[PDB]
């Protein structure tokens, strides 16, 4: 009845916590508004356009919600939710990578020589 975020979003299928929910929401809204942000950035950085239109685009860019910002997306462990020491090849933290690797869950990972 009272979703914590301004727009309704589907939940991730696996492990869930508040931080994962917040990061996932930002990921979905970045995708919906990626074209809009690129179009405003183009207008604001195209020196062929008049300064007034350029400044208008910059003002519109500064007024966008924080959940449309690409730089606020943070890679988190999809199994534990941690945001430190996360490997992008598996989207897991170093501890979960080692546990999964030794269980044979990672497609081609074996113990080094």
């Amino acid at each position: 009845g009272n979703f914590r975020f301004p727009i309704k979003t589907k939940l991730p299928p696996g492990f869930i916590n508040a931080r994962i929910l917040r990061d996932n929401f930002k990921r979905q809204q970045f995708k919906e508004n990626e074209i809009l942000v690129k179009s405003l950035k183009f207008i604001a950085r195209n020196m062929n356009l008049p300064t007034k239109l350029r400044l208008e685009a910059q003002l519109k860019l500064n007024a966008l919600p924080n959940y449309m910002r690409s730089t606020q997306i943070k890679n988190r462990c999809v199994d534990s939710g941690h945001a430190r020491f996360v490997l992008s090849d598996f989207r897991l933290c170093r501890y979960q990578f080692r546990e999964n690797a030794l269980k044979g869950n990672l497609p081609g990972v074996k113990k080094g020589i």
Binding site: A44, M47, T51, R54, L55, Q58, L59, N62
Partner: protein, 79 residues
């Protein structure tokens, strides 16, 4: 240091009311760039806890509001 070719860091602010009424502008936009229009107007700039009152002079244009609202207290030791 923002590249000059990009222009100022313009933020939405209520400047018209402060120019027709003289009311102070309370803002948290510490990144905002003090534009030449702001000169003479009164701003209340958040420092994380309180809103510091500051009036803009002509030697403040180009700087940013955050530069005039210190966020930390001076250090002291229990000598």
């Amino acid at each position: 240091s923002r590249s000059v070719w990009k222009g100022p860091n313009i933020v939405p602010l209520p400047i018209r009311e402060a120019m027709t009424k003289g009311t102070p502008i309370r803002t948290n936009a510490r990144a905002a760039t003090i534009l030449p229009q702001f000169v003479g107007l009164k701003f209340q700039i958040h420092n994380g806890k309180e809103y510091v009152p500051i009036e803009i002079s002509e030697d403040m244009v180009g700087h940013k509001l955050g530069e005039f609202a210190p966020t930390r207290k001076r250090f002291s030791y229990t000598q």
